[PDB]
Amino acid sequence: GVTTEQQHYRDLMSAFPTGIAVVTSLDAQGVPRGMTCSSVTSATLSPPTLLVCLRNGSATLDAVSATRGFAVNLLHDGGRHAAEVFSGPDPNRFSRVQWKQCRSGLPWLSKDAFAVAECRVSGTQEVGDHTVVFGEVARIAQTDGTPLLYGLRSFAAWPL
Amino acid sequence: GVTTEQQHYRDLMSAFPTGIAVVTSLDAQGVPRGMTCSSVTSATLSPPTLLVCLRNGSATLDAVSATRGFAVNLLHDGGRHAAEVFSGPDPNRFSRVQWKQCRSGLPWLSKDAFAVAECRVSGTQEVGDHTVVFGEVARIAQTDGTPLLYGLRSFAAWPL
Ligand SMILES: Cc1cc2nc3c(=O)[nH]c(=O)nc-3n(C[C@H](O)[C@H](O)[C@H](O)COP(=O)(O)OP(=O)(O)OC[C@H]3O[C@@H](n4cnc5c(N)ncnc54)[C@H](O)[C@@H]3O)c2cc1C
Ligand SMILES: Cc1cc2nc3c(=O)[nH]c(=O)nc-3n(C[C@H](O)[C@H](O)[C@H](O)COP(=O)(O)OP(=O)(O)OC[C@H]3O[C@@H](n4cnc5c(N)ncnc54)[C@H](O)[C@@H]3O)c2cc1C
Ligand SMILES: Cc1cc2nc3c(=O)[nH]c(=O)nc-3n(C[C@H](O)[C@H](O)[C@H](O)COP(=O)(O)OP(=O)(O)OC[C@H]3O[C@@H](n4cnc5c(N)ncnc54)[C@H](O)[C@@H]3O)c2cc1C
Ligand SMILES: Cc1cc2nc3c(=O)[nH]c(=O)nc-3n(C[C@H](O)[C@H](O)[C@H](O)COP(=O)(O)OP(=O)(O)OC[C@H]3O[C@@H](n4cnc5c(N)ncnc54)[C@H](O)[C@@H]3O)c2cc1C
């Protein structure tokens, strides 16, 4: 029954660095929604499926649920400003980055991302106040780029 | 082997770098098992819950499923050899690293890890030929260290 304290858990997870995505979708009104997301994780190749973990009540999760699809925009190492915009309190985040619609309508961050994966929601699992969203990847557009990172409470860039 | 569609997905996920864990457990017969794992992700803070995604039929998933506990060993930048051992074909991996048994029985990679988190399995979800394993974190030990990273088909060190 023993359970670690929340702060010790944050200190642990802060020491597992990751890339950074902006996960996007459309709300029921057709308005683009999205957030900075470091919980992008590969699940399986058969068929290609990733997952993300989104806060319950977030605008992005609501949009993902309404559209049943989402785009994962992997940020290159020039993308820190986008990652800040998409994790902070600013209104109208899509007015502050360049973006375009995918053929599906999903928002693509065309200047700040080096890759965009369009996903269909294939399932969800609530865990506490979050939801794990499974995304079956439908289409990928990918260019050369050096990934942005986040870890130990800082932004960095892939070093190689 | 992989299909063309799976290869494009691999190319995408390769470009999302991460830290590196070795996920360990004991199998039903008490033998240590483990694997190199980059799928560590945070699920929720209340209670502290992470997830990992493990291949179905792997020795490590069999052990985790049988005993319902596992340790997440986060590797420092001196831990590349352990990451290679725990992802390679040789099942004799625990004779190739220095390790210690926790009080609970879980294997701790004492020389190669800067943090260890002991987890109880709180749920699972099969996805294709993998299983997402939710771990409620029971205990963490952590020291300063530079995380090992993997991305773009290479190991690297967190750059600070
Ligand atoms: C590196 C990093 C990684 C992250 N990874 C994840 C992850 O994997 N999963 C996750 O759930 N979260 C994650 N976050 C947090 C997430 O980016 C923010 O919570 C984001 O604001 C969520 O946006 P939203 O529009 O979906 O949600 P909402 O919180 O519903 O915000 C709606 C809108 O209100 C505004 N707003 C934003 N924050 C606030 C606020 N505090 N108060 C008032 N208005 C606000 C913005 O315009 C926002 O678009 C991460 C943050 C960082 C920095
Ligand atoms: C999966 C995930 C979910 C998030 N959910 C929210 C949320 O519900 N509301 C919000 O305002 N911001 C949320 N965020 C943003 C988060 O609280 C931090 O602001 C952001 O992750 C940057 O924190 P840090 O690493 O600098 O430091 P810390 O705040 O010390 O976080 C360290 C690590 O702890 C984990 N973590 C932190 N907060 C949460 C959380 N609330 N739920 C799950 N894991 C967490 C993440 O892995 C994070 O990288 C979330 C981030 C992630 C990655
Ligand atoms: C979630 C996950 C599951 C894995 N499952 C297996 C497995 O069942 N059998 C095996 O022999 N090795 C598996 N591996 C190891 C994997 O095949 C690669 O050898 C390892 O991730 C390093 O690959 P790479 O990044 O150098 O290049 P690549 O082989 O090009 O892989 C690139 C990325 O694709 C993703 N990926 C690759 N293979 C898989 C897979 N099978 N399932 C889900 N995502 C995958 C990972 O995110 C990986 O980093 C898995 C890795 C991960 C992260
Ligand atoms: C950077 C990186 C990240 C990765 N991330 C992931 C991830 O997140 N998820 C994932 O699933 N994989 C991941 N992998 C792949 C994973 O580390 C390897 O597939 C690993 O070898 C699995 O180990 P295992 O002992 O659990 O599995 P197994 O594949 O069962 O066994 C490994 C080897 O031992 C043999 N063996 C197993 N059991 C026995 C036994 N009882 N007696 C004799 N021989 C036996 C097998 O035949 C095989 O040769 C990753 C790899 C890399 C390089």
Numbering used by the authors:
A (entry chain B), B (entry chain A): 7 to 166
Extract from the study:
The gene cluster containing the thal gene also encodes the flavin reductase ThdF. Hence, ThdF might provide reduced FADH2 for Thal in S. albogriseolus. In contrast, our steady-state kinetics showed that flavin reduction in ThdF follows an ordered sequential mechanism, with FAD binding as the first substrate followed by NADH and the respective products being released in reverse order.
The crystallization trials of ThdF in the presence of elastase resulted in two well-diffracting crystal forms (space groups: form 1: P212121; form 2: P21) of different packing with a resolution of 1.14 Å and 1.31 Å. Surprisingly, in both crystal forms, two FADs with very well-defined electron density were visible per ThdF molecule. The FAD closer to the dimer interface is stacked, bringing the adenine base and the isoalloxazine ring into close proximity. The stretched flavin forms 14 polar contacts to surrounding amino acids. The adenosine is flexible and adopts a flipped conformation in chain A of crystal form 1, suggesting that FMN should be able to bind almost as well as FAD. In ThdF, the two isoalloxazine rings are in parallel planes but orthogonal with ring III (two carbonyl moieties) of the stretched FAD (yellow carbon atoms) and ring I (two methyl groups) of the stacked FAD (wheat carbon atoms) being opposite of each other. This means that the central rings (ring II) are not directly above each other, which results in the two N5 atoms being relatively far apart (6.7 Å). The stacked FAD bound in the NADH binding site in two of our structures most likely does not represent a functional state. We assume that the unphysiologically low salt concentration during crystallization may favor the presumably nonphysiological state with two FADs per ThdF protomer.
